[PDB]
Design a protein around this ligand. Structure first.
Ligand SMILES: C=CC1=C(C)[C@@H](Cc2[nH]c(/C=C3N=C(/C=C4\NC(=O)[C@H](C)[C@H]4CC)C(C)=C\3CCC(=O)O)c(CCC(=O)O)c2C)NC1=O
Ligand SMILES: C=CC1=C(C)[C@@H](Cc2[nH]c(/C=C3N=C(/C=C4\NC(=O)[C@H](C)[C@H]4CC)C(C)=C\3CCC(=O)O)c(CCC(=O)O)c2C)NC1=O
Ligand SMILES: C=CC1=C(C)[C@@H](Cc2[nH]c(/C=C3N=C(/C=C4\NC(=O)[C@H](C)[C@H]4CC)C(C)=C\3CCC(=O)O)c(CCC(=O)O)c2C)NC1=O
Ligand SMILES: C=CC1=C(C)[C@@H](Cc2[nH]c(/C=C3N=C(/C=C4\NC(=O)[C@H](C)[C@H]4CC)C(C)=C\3CCC(=O)O)c(CCC(=O)O)c2C)NC1=O
Ligand SMILES: C=CC1=C(C)[C@@H](Cc2[nH]c(/C=C3N=C(/C=C4\NC(=O)[C@H](C)[C@H]4CC)C(C)=C\3CCC(=O)O)c(CCC(=O)O)c2C)NC1=O
Ligand SMILES: C=CC1=C(C)[C@@H](Cc2[nH]c(/C=C3N=C(/C=C4\NC(=O)[C@H](C)[C@H]4CC)C(C)=C\3CCC(=O)O)c(CCC(=O)O)c2C)NC1=O
Ligand SMILES: C=CC1=C(C)[C@@H](Cc2[nH]c(/C=C3N=C(/C=C4\NC(=O)[C@H](C)[C@H]4CC)C(C)=C\3CCC(=O)O)c(CCC(=O)O)c2C)NC1=O
Ligand SMILES: C=CC1=C(C)[C@@H](Cc2[nH]c(/C=C3N=C(/C=C4\NC(=O)[C@H](C)[C@H]4CC)C(C)=C\3CCC(=O)O)c(CCC(=O)O)c2C)NC1=O
Ligand SMILES: C=CC1=C(C)[C@@H](Cc2[nH]c(/C=C3N=C(/C=C4\NC(=O)[C@H](C)[C@H]4CC)C(C)=C\3CCC(=O)O)c(CCC(=O)O)c2C)NC1=O
Ligand SMILES: C=CC1=C(C)[C@@H](Cc2[nH]c(/C=C3N=C(/C=C4\NC(=O)[C@H](C)[C@H]4CC)C(C)=C\3CCC(=O)O)c(CCC(=O)O)c2C)NC1=O
Ligand SMILES: CCC1=C(C)/C(=C/C2=NC(=C\c3[nH]c(/C=C4\NC(=O)[C@H](C)[C@H]4CC)c(C)c3CCC(=O)O)/C(CCC(=O)O)=C2C)NC1=O
Ligand SMILES: CCC1=C(C)/C(=C/C2=NC(=C\c3[nH]c(/C=C4\NC(=O)[C@H](C)[C@H]4CC)c(C)c3CCC(=O)O)/C(CCC(=O)O)=C2C)NC1=O
Ligand SMILES: CCC1=C(C)/C(=C/C2=NC(=C\c3[nH]c(/C=C4\NC(=O)[C@H](C)[C@H]4CC)c(C)c3CCC(=O)O)/C(CCC(=O)O)=C2C)NC1=O
Ligand SMILES: CCC1=C(C)/C(=C/C2=NC(=C\c3[nH]c(/C=C4\NC(=O)[C@H](C)[C@H]4CC)c(C)c3CCC(=O)O)/C(CCC(=O)O)=C2C)NC1=O
Lengths: 172, 58, 324, 177, 162, 172, 177, 172
């Protein structure tokens, strides 16, 4: 897979030249968020069970179809199949957030997810709410500076929530 | 043990139809009932690991 | 863009938006003189519709500069006008003479009728006319039947119709129809399943076998497996395609079985350390790990999880997954 | 399309024999029981609007996630299509029992509806819960043990016939499976 | 189908190797004995109806019960004797196919694989076919190195029945 | 696999409710016929190589075009693979005799069997006429009054025919 | 077919959201400076075929051997298809600008253009080398930074929409990357 | 994997008759021209890379967009993998030259090779040029009279040109 440093080298080889000096100080903004990316990982990797409990607490309440006799997640391995599938949409986003792109997100999780739910009959309607119940649950969880100094992180809140909606449109 | 009774004639036909792979064909041979009563009932678990690493992993 | 229940519409994102937006009917019983931007739009519509979005330049449109003018008073459209366009050198250069007889038949149904013929008894009725009564009655075998005199009254333009339940074709003719239609940016030639030199559906159109209906423009839709039949009567080979059936003790050992469809791997990707093993990068016999790509697997429900890992850690993209 | 009368012909064709008296004994008893089957299928097709009523309004109370905004029966075209998709598949098995052969069901619809449905995105477990809700809806009508409407037949026991429309509808559900 | 040519291709394909001087003498030595083996195949072809019916009677002289016992696995009837003459004609045909290709390819594929499933099912004895093939071995009437090639592929068939 | 007891478990698990009392007295009728089930499977598998080789012999008699050279069942590889599939249906029919339903016969052996045969090119009308020899060689085998005492087992021989005609209509 | 007026109504019908006036202010920002989109569209569709005039001519000056024997734009037939190949995709760029979504370049063009250009052997590097040339060729009429021409404008910052064409030019090299 | 001798044997067995007298001298013709065929593949294995590097440097001088930065065969991990495919088809035609037929050639190389070249995004018209760039160099040394006694080897190098022509068709 390729990363956020690699694509401006992938456009330095497939174009074919040396480095422009406007390509070098565009990477200064990557380390203007470089420490500020690193504590954003602490708001999601220290709360791994915390989001996926608090979201599937909510998701069968307004949508009681999943717990019906004859519903989808009925047996306990299918209910454990929800919890192994709710976290990886957040885990590969957590791989995408330390990366800075969505290459490894598309490589190992997303490409092969619309049709895999359709072959199994698990709905594309409600695997997007499992994105959306953890979408607002990490907008609140990462917007607080408990341990780190105070300034501007108004970019990267529109990047990890710039990756959940990428996972939302790649499944419906 | 390539005798007539130790052959697996239904596992052989699914290889020839390209239904299963070689990796699913080796897995059908260790789980074959000739491999249990001839090579698994007559030694313990610490010698059977010496069989399934010498033959499988090579 | 991908979506089934994304905005309540299942087939606008399958590639049939403009084939369901337009209807292309003409409104006057003769083309009126004076204005030449209202009926030339009908002609260049049909020049992409009948030819299958092929490039007709003006260097060959003026070669065919009679046959549209006799339509403007004297021929009907869809019955006579594209019939006259089907008797041209430009129609005979793309869909008759670079390809076999069945491939000329099975591309003519997409051109003329807007469907795919199922089995061979629909190939029987069309190819009983070429070997007896030439090419001009072969093209006019389509135009004077119940399959043509009912769906279009004679002043529309023949559209695509091989997806609806009123077009009572088959259920397999749906599955061939998205082998033939790859969005609105292809042709007879710019189609990977068959170019102009080839035949689209040799086995599958004859034996009525349905296929994996892949949405076009998806991630890794650059896949089609090749053909070699297996068995010793027909002297075939083994190892090219996974089977379409999944019977036996490995049918219901791991639950319900599935057929996956891998797009393709490379040499960087096999290791779990993000690179290439610097060395001789091969074995001694100089083949790949997957020595031909676009391969496929048959796997049960209880090993879908490590196989979906083992494709995706190695650089393989997945076309679709169909249960067997 | 195959007929049961056609089924003994290709039985007698690769065998290269004539028609004997041996396999003829199945078909002459099929004649005199033909009226009993003719007393069956007329009530299948004349209560068909109830059978497509309870096809789709019954399966939606046991999974209402399709009328939810985002589901697979939410809009009023997919609401219209699910009323329409079920009233063709019982029209085909009404053809299939008069021939007796399931191959007319196979080549027309049951060869390839499964490959469309995961590209049309609909779930198959919802479909077989809607297939089997017409299964016991059918077998009440052939025996006259239906509750709210009781129709005119003769007196006997068509439980050989009532297994046959249950021998069709599982293969209706296994085709989508 | 193993031939000498489709065996030295296979060891060349194992090593990724262009066809060296090692694999150009395995295919040359087939050509120095394709002369003697194709006269033996031409001689056994012409004397087929002498050798088939003569070996079918030499079975019946050694094992006389096969012409006497009732039931469908024996040569006691007209159609029982016709299927026995078909079987030695199947056996003698695969000897001549091996002298063409220079090895035991066509009797491995078309004859030997799956043979013991038949001989146990249809109650046919494997010693009925040794006596048919030991007739053909020392009554083909060949000589020299022409006989050396026909006597190699005859007792390959005796060893897969024994 | 499913037997008859596994039917009404899964026929009420999606329904949700418990086992109702009006069904199980039909299922305690089935254990009265439990001893007339196991003799009858013992009647088939004791003669399990005399129903195969007596009906392949009567198949090639009426159809000589399969054992003629250039036929489908010509060579010894493809004769052994014709007697293999003639015994495979004899297993999975008698598996469905002991269980009470069809659902191991048409899930492990008949799900794509004619489309196996259309790809290989075997005559699928002619495997049905070998099976209908094996139907008549086994129904008339399971009406002997030796080995068992007499009594009416006419209900249980229609189930043995009903899976032999289910393989007669699977392969065409 | 999507546009930015109806991008929200396929978003809000996951929510079943009767749209109170909070989310509509981006649409009231879309109707605010949509004249700058409109004053750029007339700066595109009047200067349209001179974008493609130096597209393949800019490609062949640095990638010279496609007019060589064994090229791709060798003959007159091989070259004139390429000039309609580039003018189709720039026609389909500027449909998306006045609409406001990424609809039209995906649901018609890149619903199958990756298998198109590998069915013909169209080189994907040279068929993005021209479009990267046509990237910066298409920003200069919006910017009015051109060496040769000036368009009669009003003077503001259209840099939200000067890179929005480059935010359509990125996902035309999504599949043909 | 068939041979020339095994192809006429396998047509005889499916008809069910012995080989005719016109077929043995058709093969006795084929064995007396064996030393011509052994002299052909000795010429194109004693120059089994001097063909290939001189066919690569011919093609790379002609077509220059292969070596261009951004190219298909630009980098040195896609350069030996270009020289791998140029060296195995010189290997696998020479296996098909010594067999007498080409059923070794299509099944071990060319079955779906233009489908894997479709998946990589490889220009396939230029590799068909490279087989034709290798084809005439292969017959220029087959016609080379050095060290061998002089005779007529006319149709054998038209057979060898037909093997390269069958390879060059099904790669585009
Ligand atoms: C070595 C591992 C490593 C970490 C675990 C993090 C933690 C971390 N963040 C910052 C530094 C910072 N951290 C933030 C982050 C935030 N402030 C906010 O208002 C947001 C709510 C919150 C994001 C969740 C900001 C804005 C700064 C820079 C301080 C400033 O703007 O003046 C610093 C001080 C050094 C520096 O400036 O880089 C450290 C150690 N960074 C790291 O390098
Ligand atoms: C609405 C969507 C839509 C499109 C995008 C085009 C897509 C398209 N492109 C081509 C076809 C082509 N397009 C190119 C173009 C190029 N190759 C290069 O190397 C250059 C970099 C590049 C020019 C910019 C070439 C060379 C052909 C092939 C023409 C030929 O084969 O002679 C064809 C085949 C038409 C025919 O020949 O009949 C089609 C349908 N058409 C559409 O309807
Ligand atoms: C979930 C919401 C819900 C409904 C929409 C109704 C629909 C409904 N009806 C029946 C069950 C049935 N439905 C019919 C159908 C009919 N009866 C007649 O005589 C008419 C002619 C015909 C049209 C109405 C029949 C015959 C039965 C079997 C019961 C019986 O009458 O014996 C069943 C049980 C079938 C099953 O699920 O296995 C359901 C769910 N009931 C509900 O609980
Ligand atoms: C042989 C009979 C026969 C059929 C069934 C249909 C097969 C079929 N069904 C649908 C299409 C459909 N069919 C259904 C029905 C259902 N989906 C569900 O979720 C429920 C399980 C089930 C109702 C019981 C729905 C909801 C659509 C979607 C319509 C759409 O996508 O616009 C379409 C697409 C129609 C189009 O694109 O124009 C087709 C071809 N045609 C036939 O000839
Ligand atoms: C014009 C339209 C038309 C029809 C409707 C049928 C009418 C019909 N039904 C039956 C006759 C019958 N139908 C049944 C069938 C049944 N009885 C039951 O107890 C079950 C509820 C049900 C299905 C199992 C039985 C048992 C008979 C009597 C046996 C017989 O003579 O067929 C008969 C023969 C005897 C008679 O003349 O009445 C006829 C002609 N045929 C037609 O031509
Ligand atoms: C392990 C293997 C095994 C079996 C196969 C059965 C065999 C078996 N059957 C019967 C007993 C019987 N079995 C039959 C059965 C038949 N009579 C017929 O005419 C038919 C041909 C045939 C059915 C297939 C009858 C009619 C009786 C006596 C009635 C009765 O069971 O009460 C008995 C005596 C005890 C009893 O009466 O139940 C036993 C042990 N039990 C076993 O333990
Ligand atoms: C080797 C040969 C060679 C060429 C053919 C040109 C091709 C070319 N043109 C432009 C770039 C451009 N081309 C145009 C097009 C036009 N200007 C107008 O106003 C006219 C109306 C219209 C036709 C003349 C515009 C507006 C730009 C961007 C700015 C500019 O150069 O004016 C660019 C820069 C794009 C980029 O940055 O990637 C290039 C490489 N350059 C070369 O090196
Ligand atoms: C049918 C044809 C038709 C149109 C195209 C529009 C024409 C149009 N364009 C603008 C207006 C404008 N256009 C620009 C744009 C720019 N200024 C620059 O120097 C930049 C280079 C460029 C930014 C990309 C700006 C800044 C305005 C004024 C703000 C506004 O959009 O209202 C205005 C508003 C000015 C006014 O109120 O009079 C109008 C009416 N109307 C029409 O009837
Ligand atoms: C009376 C005068 C007279 C001659 C000198 C030769 C001259 C000559 N040499 C060769 C041709 C040849 N001649 C030889 C023979 C030899 N090469 C050697 O290095 C060995 C010393 C020697 C004996 C083994 C070989 C090996 C060739 C084939 C090489 C080639 O391609 O020229 C040919 C063509 C075919 C032939 O006839 O052989 C001719 C005409 N012929 C004549 O009529
Ligand atoms: C073990 C490895 C091995 C070899 C390398 C060759 C080497 C070789 N070639 C020939 C013999 C020959 N070689 C050739 C071939 C040719 N002559 C030409 O001038 C053409 C360039 C070329 C055609 C392709 C001919 C034509 C003969 C027979 C000489 C003659 O025509 O009288 C002979 C003499 C005996 C024989 O025919 O076999 C030998 C040993 N043979 C082998 O067994
Ligand atoms: C490599 C990373 C990876 C991905 C992307 C992946 C997808 C994946 N999800 C699966 C199942 C599943 N996924 C779900 C999840 C859901 N269904 C719903 O209705 C809910 C809305 C939703 C969340 C609770 C369920 C219920 C199944 C089991 C399907 C079944 O048994 O019917 C399966 C089948 C095997 C299994 O049960 O795990 C795969 C392969 N698996 C992986 O290992
Ligand atoms: C079993 C025998 C066999 C077949 C059938 C085969 C096909 C094949 N060709 C490949 C690559 C390739 N093939 C080429 C060849 C070319 N590209 C060009 O521009 C030239 C026109 C042409 C030859 C000079 C190149 C450059 C690659 C590497 C592409 C990549 O790695 O992305 C790959 C990818 C793995 C690899 O590096 O080998 C496969 C599987 N490989 C095999 O081992
Ligand atoms: C090419 C490879 C090949 C072999 C070897 C082969 C053997 C073969 N021999 C058979 C029968 C037979 N073979 C014999 C032969 C004999 N019984 C005697 O009494 C004689 C001693 C002896 C002759 C030497 C007889 C009598 C039958 C008929 C058995 C029956 O009808 O049940 C049958 C049963 C079908 C039939 O021919 O009617 C097969 C398949 N088939 C093959 O395709
Ligand atoms: C798990 C249970 C199972 C089923 C259901 C099955 C079907 C099956 N039958 C096959 C072949 C076959 N089946 C037949 C049988 C016949 N053809 C005829 O013409 C006769 C009418 C009939 C024999 C009486 C023949 C001749 C072959 C071809 C064998 C070959 O090509 O090697 C093959 C190809 C592999 C092989 O056996 O060679 C499969 C997969 N195989 C299985 O293992």
């Amino acid at each position: 897979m390729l990363d956020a440093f690699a694509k401006v080298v992938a456009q330095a080889d497939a174009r074919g030249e040396f480095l422009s000096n406007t390509q070098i100080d565009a990477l200064s903004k990557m380390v203007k968020e470089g420490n500020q990316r690193l504590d954003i990982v602490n708001k999601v990797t220290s709360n791994a069970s915390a989001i996926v409990t608090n979201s599937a607490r909510a998701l069968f309440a307004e949508q009681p179809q999943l717990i019906q006799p004859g519903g989808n997640a009925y047996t306990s391995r299918r209910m454990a199949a929800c919890l192994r599938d709710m976290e990886i949409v957040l885990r590969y986003v957590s791989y995408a957030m330390i990366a800075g792109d969505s290459s490894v997100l598309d490589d190992r999780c997303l490409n092969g997810l619309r049709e895999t739910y359709q072959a199994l009959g698990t709905p594309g309607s409600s695997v997007a709410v499992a994105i959306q119940k953890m979408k607002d649950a990490s907008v609140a969880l990462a917007n607080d500076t408990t341990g780190t100094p105070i300034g501007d992180c108004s970019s990267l809140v529109a990047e990890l929530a710039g990756y959940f909606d990428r996972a939302a449109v790649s499944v419906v | 043990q390539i005798l007539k009774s130790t052959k697996q004639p239904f596992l052989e036909s699914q290889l020839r139809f390209n239904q299963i792979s070689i990796k699913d064909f080796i897995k059908g041979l260790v789980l074959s009932a000739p491999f249990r009563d001839l090579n698994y009932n007559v030694n313990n678990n610490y010698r059977f690991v010496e069989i399934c690493v010498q033959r499988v992993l090579g | 863009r991908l979506g089934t229940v994304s905005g309540n519409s299942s087939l606008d994102k399958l590639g049939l938006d403009k084939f369901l937006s337009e209807s292309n009917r003409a409104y006057t019983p003769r083309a009126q003189p004076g204005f030449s931007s209202e009926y030339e739009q009908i002609i260049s519509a049909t020049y992409k519709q009948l030819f299958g979005n092929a490039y007709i330049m003006d260097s060959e449109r003026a070669e065919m500069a009679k046959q549209e003018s006799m339509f403007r008073d004297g021929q009907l459209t869809l019955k006579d006008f594209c019939r006259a366009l089907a008797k041209t050198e430009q129609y005979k250069k793309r869909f008759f003479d670079s390809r076999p007889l069945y491939g000329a038949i099975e591309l003519n149904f997409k051109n003329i009728l807007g469907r795919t013929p199922d089995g061979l008894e629909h190939y029987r009725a069309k190819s009983a006319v070429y070997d007896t009564k030439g090419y001009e009655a072969f093209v006019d075998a389509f135009f004077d039947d119940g399959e043509y005199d009912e769906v279009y009254d004679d002043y529309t333009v023949p559209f695509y119709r091989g997806y609806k339940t009123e077009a009572n074709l088959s259920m397999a003719a749906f599955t061939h129809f998205f082998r033939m239609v790859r969005g609105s940016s292809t042709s007879d030639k710019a189609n990977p399943n068959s170019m102009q030199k080839d035949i689209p559906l040799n086995y599958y159109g004859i034996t009525k076998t349905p296929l994996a209906v892949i949405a076009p423009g998806a991630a890794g839709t650059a896949y089609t497996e090749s053909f070699a039949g297996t068995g010793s009567w027909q002297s075939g080979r083994a190892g090219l395609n996974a089977a379409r059936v999944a019977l036996g003790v490995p049918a219901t050992a791991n639950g319900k079985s599935f057929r996956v469809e891998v797009t393709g791997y490379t040499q960087p990707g096999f290791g779990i350390t993000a690179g290439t093993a610097v060395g001789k990068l091969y074995k001694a016999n100089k083949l790949s790990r997957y020595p031909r790509s676009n391969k496929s697997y048959v796997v049960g429900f209880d090993e879908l999880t490590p196989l979906y890992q083992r494709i995706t850690k190695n650089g393989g993209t997945i076309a679709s997954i169909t249960p067997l | 399309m195959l007929d049961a009368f056609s089924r003994v012909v290709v039985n007698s064709d690769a065998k290269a024999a004539y028609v004997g008296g041996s396999d003829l004994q199945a078909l002459k008893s099929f004649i005199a029981d033909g009226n009993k089957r003719l007393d069956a299928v007329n009530s299948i097709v004349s209560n068909a609007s109830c059978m497509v009523s309870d096809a789709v309004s019954g399966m939606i109370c046991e999974n209402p996630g399709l009328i939810s905004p985002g589901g697979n029966c939410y809009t009023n075209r997919r609401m219209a299509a699910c009323l329409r998709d079920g009233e063709i598949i019982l029209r085909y098995v009404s053809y299939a029992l008069l021939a007796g052969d399931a191959s007319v069901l196979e080549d027309r619809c049951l060869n390839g509806l499964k490959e469309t449905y995961i590209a049309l995105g609909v779930p198959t477990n919802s479909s077989i819960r809607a297939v089997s809700i017409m299964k016991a809806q059918a077998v009440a009508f052939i025996t006259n043990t239906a509750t709210e409407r009781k129709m005119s037949f003769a007196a006997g026991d068509c439980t050989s016939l009532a297994s046959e429309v249950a021998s069709y509808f599982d293969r209706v559900g296994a085709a989508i499976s | 189908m193993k031939t000498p040519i489709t065996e030295a291709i296979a060891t060349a394909d194992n090593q990724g190797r262009f066809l060296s001087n090692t694999e150009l003498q395995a295919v040359n030595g087939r050509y120095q004995r394709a002369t003697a083996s194709l006269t033996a195949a031409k001689a056994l072809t012409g004397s087929a109806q002498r050798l088939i019916t003569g070996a079918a009677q030499a079975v019946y002289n050694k094992f006389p019960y096969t012409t006497q016992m009732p039931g469908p696995a024996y040569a006691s009837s007209a159609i029982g004797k016709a299927k026995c003459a078909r079987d030695i004609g199947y056996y003698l045909r695969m000897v001549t196919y091996c002298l063409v290709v220079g090895g035991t390819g066509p009797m491995d594929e078309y004859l030997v694989a799956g043979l013991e499933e038949i001989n146990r099912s249809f109650d046919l004895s494997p010693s009925w076919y040794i006596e048919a093939l030991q007739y053909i071995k020392n009554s083909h009437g060949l000589s020299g190195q022409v006989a050396n090639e026909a006597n190699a592929y005859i007792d390959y068939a005796i060893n897969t029945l024994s």
